[PDB]
Amino acid sequence: MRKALITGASRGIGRAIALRLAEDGFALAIHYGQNREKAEEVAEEARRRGSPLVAVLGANLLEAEAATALVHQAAEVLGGLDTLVNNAGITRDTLLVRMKDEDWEAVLEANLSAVFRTTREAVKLMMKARFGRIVNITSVVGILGNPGQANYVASKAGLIGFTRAVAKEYAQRGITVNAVAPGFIETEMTERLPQEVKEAYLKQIPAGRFGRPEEVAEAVAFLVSEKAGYITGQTLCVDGGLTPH
Amino acid sequence: RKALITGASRGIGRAIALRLAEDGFALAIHYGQNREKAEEVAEEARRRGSPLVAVLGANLLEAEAATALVHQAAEVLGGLDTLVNNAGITRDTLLVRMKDEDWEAVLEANLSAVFRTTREAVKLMMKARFGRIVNITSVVGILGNPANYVASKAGLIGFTRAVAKEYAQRGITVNAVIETEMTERLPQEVKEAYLKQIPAGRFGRPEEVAEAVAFLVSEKAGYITGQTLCVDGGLTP
Amino acid sequence: MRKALITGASRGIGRAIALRLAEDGFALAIHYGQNREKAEEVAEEARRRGSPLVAVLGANLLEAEAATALVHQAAEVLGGLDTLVNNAGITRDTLLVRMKDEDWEAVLEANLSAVFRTTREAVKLMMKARFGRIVNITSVVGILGNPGQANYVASKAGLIGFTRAVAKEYAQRGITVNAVAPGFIETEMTERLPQEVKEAYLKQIPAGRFGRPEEVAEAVAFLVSEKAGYITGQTLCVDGGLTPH
Amino acid sequence: RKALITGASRGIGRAIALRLAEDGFALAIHYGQNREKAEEVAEEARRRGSPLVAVLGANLLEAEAATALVHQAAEVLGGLDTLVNNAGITRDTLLVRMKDEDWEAVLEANLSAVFRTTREAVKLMMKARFGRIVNITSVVGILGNPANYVASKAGLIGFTRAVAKEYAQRGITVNAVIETEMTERLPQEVKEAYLKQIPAGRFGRPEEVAEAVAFLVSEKAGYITGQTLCVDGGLTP
């Protein structure tokens, strides 16, 4: 409806999701980990695109109490909360045999357990109004299981099962819970990658084109619609034909 | 925008046509037998903002009818960039009692006819280098509840993925999407048993399936292809 | 148990499945389309490997009455029928826009409608004994949807939905119905293919190796076991890691 | 053959150990707390033909315990070529009542501990250029019935696919597999409601899940990897 909290909204997909919902007149809490100035930049642009209430909120979601507090902070600053987009996520890519306990733990913590925490707190608020929209930004690799990042794949596949369980548990309380699974989306960060990496990724995609963050946001805006009330428990891939889903 | 919607005289097809009418699509409203009901839909689509609506009768069990239908639609609309394969039939029965004819009819109308319509449409889209195809499949193509209909709808999901990958670099996308339709005609005891299976605890409305179709046919969905979206209240994993 | 009908058992996967079950002491009806002498070859080898009753049966499954008759012929020649492996299948590969009505119809007929016919007739017999094993040999492309053969993909995806429906409809009657989805299996026929084709196929496979027909047969032998009674409605991919299933 | 089976003192784990015993595997029987029950299983495995059986106590909630466990098993058996990650815990509750600790414990034991065991095993397998890993996951990782346990098991399916693809050319395979266990302890009304959902209309037996594990750990399954096989009486699509 009228409130949303978007995690990791200072750049890339989160920013696009933030700016897209601003265009729909949503009030927005723009969450960020470190780059506060960038988050403020997005907040100003969201205001310029039509958002009537925008606040920036800084939290390190690796801190257990941070993810729990974030939802209540967001609700306070917005005057309520009816929408949660769990977009934030980190990588610690390595081969399994070289992967340290900490490299695994950080990725599962930020990408899955933190999303637990935010989802649980958001549902408690949504249950009372008898309306809510929750969208988890997973990754196609959660389905495909491409090598080199078994930690990241486990986290994103877990996020999908998580999405289905919460969907089923809250469906008669007016809350939908869905996932959006980006393929290979071109951002400032992926452009930093070696040329060799880009071409190998690009090679896998039937559409023969990286996606744009704005495309992922369109799917997000569709699911958080009041008009998407009978869609729940679903994973929608935005990937140019990469995933057989 | 110019769209052919199959089986658009009632239920989900009718909802898709009226919803696309609201986006100002020109529309070819296909029907099998009930022409008058198709005209009523066509009248309502005009009233909702479609600048050009035409009705087209074709029995999709005739092979030449499916093929001709896309050409007829393109001629009446002045081109064709969207195809919504919604029309479908059932001939329900236990496998052990299922006659060859009852298998063949369901496969024909629901899958082979869709093959022919999609073939003809892609030819036209691939000239313009733009297209949207949405197959209305059913959750039972995944769940396989107790066989002709399920085979047809599963085959339709496979076909969607195949055609998506084949035309992905030609600016064409190909995607697939318990609803209150003629379903209201069913015994109260059957309905209530369906309802207990649905986490949302309510049947969907045709307009809800239509909203997903409208999103997928939008230019806002250009990077979505090969996908099957369930609109089902949490029913299917 | 003790009877099986294997379709398309004169070469490749069907032959391997035939020879594998012979090793388990099964009685076998070896079905073939055209190459009768090759079918007799397989029958002799099945005998040499331990099958106590082997018969060759010729049928063109494009003929509706052929697929229906086949099961009854098999039952007659074997003294009963408790196992059906639907392995037979044809291709008519072309781009969608060049695909003739007949190229589509032939592939759906032989690969799906014919399997209807055999499955329906087999279930009728199995229902009475309160035991049966049905395995459909699909293809990973039924899930993946690789281009160039939309007819073949529709047929194999339909075969999967079909497998699930019949599984659910007959599960309390002691019958299991499962599918085995071969990846890229090296046979006499695939070796005939241009070198360029082989390398592109091979390139997609994590295991970096074509499968052997014998490997597909091992999976088949597992599912038709009496010990596999709680497995039904499932699709088991034998593909070196190609399909995310 | 030398296998480590986690949580092998009872139910499915015990069935897997006894079934592998019949193929003459040397076995490391892991248990969390009930050592005596693990010894009983170890005794029965010897009696069924295992040439070398050892029991290993480790609380997989301790990070160093999971890591050490694979090294202990390899030392007692004289190597290790098979790992069956079967051990799992539940802390069931509605999401809105689910404490941080109850989420974390289930994720730890069911997923993070499996990460650590699999990591250690692949190191050893990848020296020998041969290995079999089977993750015992649960159909609920797919179905998502009403969240900690489901997340853990879905994550385990993802992890299986990821590790399969990473070690596919090293002669190692990585695969995943309502059963009558402690499930008999449940109220009759709960059991009967589960049964109505199962097309086969009966609960599975631990030995049936064990048979699938034995097939996947065989050299006859060398070209199967990255896959999840449900043993469920037709429950999951």
Side-chain angles (χ1 to χ4, degrees), chain A residues 121-138:
Chain A
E121 299 311 311
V123 164
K124 295 177 173 172
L125 302 176
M126 290 166 185
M127 272 181 101
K128 305 194 182 183
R130 269 242 189 116
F131 179 89
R133 289 296 182 270
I134 300 175
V135 178
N136 301 319
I137 309 302
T138 184

Side-chain angles (χ1 to χ4, degrees), chain B residues 11 13 36 49-50 64-65 78 83 87 117 128 136-137 142 155 159 163 187 200 203 214 222:
Chain B
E36 55 168 69
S50 172
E64 299 317 316
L83 171 55
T117 66
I136 304 307
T137 187
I142 299 176
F159 184 72
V163 177
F203 298 123

Side-chain angles (χ1 to χ4, degrees), chain C residues 193-209:
Chain C
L193 298 166
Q195 186 68 10
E196 186 231 5
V197 174
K198 300 176 195 177
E199 264 189 332
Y201 277 61
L202 182 62
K203 178 59 157 85
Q204 297 176 37
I205 308 164
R209 183 179 65 81

Side-chain angles (χ1 to χ4, degrees), chain C residues 23-56:
Chain C
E23 284 161 21
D24 281 345
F26 273 61
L28 297 165
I30 283 111
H31 163 272
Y32 70 90
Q34 290 171 68
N35 198 333
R36 178 199 300 96
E37 320 163 5
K38 187 76 175 63
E40 294 279 14
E41 238 160 60
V42 175
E44 286 290 36
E45 187 61 26
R47 289 178 194 111
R48 288 199 286 263
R49 304 200 178 189
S51 182
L53 173 43
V54 187
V56 168

Side-chain angles (χ1 to χ4, degrees), chain A residues 162-171 173:
Chain A
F162 181 73
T163 298
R164 309 185 170 166
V166 182
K168 297 224 202 158
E169 186 170 310
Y170 300 87
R173 300 189 185 98

Side-chain angles (χ1 to χ4, degrees), chain A residues 164 168 171 184 205-211 215 218-219 222 227 230-232 234 237-241 243-245, chain B residues 161 165 168-169 178 198-204 208 211-212 215 220 223-225 227-228 230-234 236-237:
Chain A
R164 309 185 170 166
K168 297 224 202 158
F184 302 146
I205 308 164
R209 183 179 65 81
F210 292 132
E215 299 179 306
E218 292 301 332
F222 165 62
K227 292 176 183 54
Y230 211 52
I231 299 166
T232 192
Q234 291 290 112
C237 290
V238 185
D239 72 357
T243 315
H245 198 253
Chain B
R161 288 179 188 178
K165 280 192 201 213
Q169 320 190 334
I178 293 118
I198 310 172
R202 53 171 274 240
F203 298 123
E208 296 177 304
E211 194 64 33
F215 166 64
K220 308 167 291 260
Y223 203 55
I224 305 172
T225 196
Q227 309 309 123
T228 302
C230 300
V231 176
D232 73 0
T236 315

